[PDB]
Design a protein around this ligand. Sequence first.
Ligand SMILES: OC[C@H]1O[C@@H](O[C@H]2[C@H](O)[C@@H](O)[C@H](O[C@H]3[C@H](O)[C@@H](O)[C@H](O[C@H]4[C@H](O)[C@@H](O)[C@H](O[C@H]5[C@H](O)[C@@H](O)[C@H](O)O[C@@H]5CO)O[C@@H]4CO)O[C@@H]3CO)O[C@@H]2CO)[C@H](O)[C@@H](O)[C@@H]1O
Ligand code: NA
Length: 399
Amino acid sequence: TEEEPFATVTENDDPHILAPVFPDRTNGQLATFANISRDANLSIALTVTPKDYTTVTWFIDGQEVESGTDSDKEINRSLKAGTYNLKIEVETVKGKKTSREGLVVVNPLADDPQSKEVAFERIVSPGKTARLYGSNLQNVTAILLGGNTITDPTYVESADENYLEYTIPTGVSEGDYRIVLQDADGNQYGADMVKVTNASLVISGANRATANVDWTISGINLENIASLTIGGQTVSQFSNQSSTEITLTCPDLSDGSYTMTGKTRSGEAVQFLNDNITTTEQTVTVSTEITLWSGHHYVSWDKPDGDPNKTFGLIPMDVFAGITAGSTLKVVYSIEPTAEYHKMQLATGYWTGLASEMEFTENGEYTLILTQDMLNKIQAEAGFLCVGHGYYVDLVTVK
Ligand SMILES: OC[C@H]1O[C@@H](O[C@H]2[C@H](O)[C@@H](O)[C@H](O[C@H]3[C@H](O)[C@@H](O)[C@H](O[C@H]4[C@H](O)[C@@H](O)[C@H](O[C@H]5[C@H](O)[C@@H](O)[C@H](O)O[C@@H]5CO)O[C@@H]4CO)O[C@@H]3CO)O[C@@H]2CO)[C@H](O)[C@@H](O)[C@@H]1O
Ligand code: NA
């Protein structure tokens, strides 16, 4: 009370949470207070000083919530699957307060329809289609998103992981929403957060770029992009341009770090996501790709010693002697269709592996960072070889 003539010593005490002891932040990132199943309830029981002169309030994702017990300092709450922000705010009668903030992880059951974020598919755009990846999602007849009931979910069979395709309503404004999966029976299951944005948001592929060659960037509303500026060099002509992807020619820049910005058609600034931080400026590392060798050279360790196609030599030691530690070697390889199997390995002249033997079925690019130890061993062991069977070396580059 305030009208009180005076406050007892115990009333004016600082608030302390004695038990339980909560973990400290990981490294700015919040710690986990609870890790329970969707069928179990969030159960935390506080002991607090002063005994009879403290009130505690609970917040799930910033929203105040009743403690499901007669006591106000024990919470009992049934939560849907997901990860939740929990705040524990303790206040005394004379207004002094202490605080705890942590995560509550609620795991689904095996048979539950469930979904987590794999890559960046939880960033969605109003009017457009989006994907959920998870388990048992063929059960879902509706998704609930910020008051809207999305009733057109389609479970797509894929060569990779299957997904639940759904359309975001146009009416939904920007922000973060906690989605819920609904059965035909009516049962509801948690599927964590979705982020709705109208912004042209570049998400991945924009950290690194090779000068004077194709550069593919992945985002959400990238068709609205009118131009990108790297260094001081503006690019307004693109090879591909869709919602999810844009490809351009990285301009002729010296090796180093550069600022990238962009402009939409409306004139607003292109946004960039890096570690769940959104900026209007992106740091791009540019490097030039040097060609060391070009052609079409078959490799088979079946062929006899002395045969030019038993290995890939053809890049002399003095070239590798010049390469600086940290550089990325790339070997572009293609299969021989008539070959029974396809295995390759990068090695020294002594056939010491610089990395694992790899088995493959399709054409590709093998990249490997050459450390100072690797470079030293190459000089010590008679140079560089590509070894294996049933493939061709078509290009070798370094940057
Ligand atoms: O055949 C099918 C089968 O192939 C398997 O792969 C085999 C491959 O078939 C073999 O040809 C290959 O043999 C290489 C040896 O593994 C490798 O150690 C050896 O390297 C020699 C090098 O030839 C030689 O010049 C070097 O001499 C140096 C001295 O050691 C130094 O003291 C001196 O100062 O300088 C000289 C340099 O001139 O010694 C090294 C070894 O120490 O080269 C062989 C080929 O010539 O082995 C492969 C297995 O690793 C494949 O695994 C199967 O799957 C496949 O069915
Ligand atoms: Na799955």
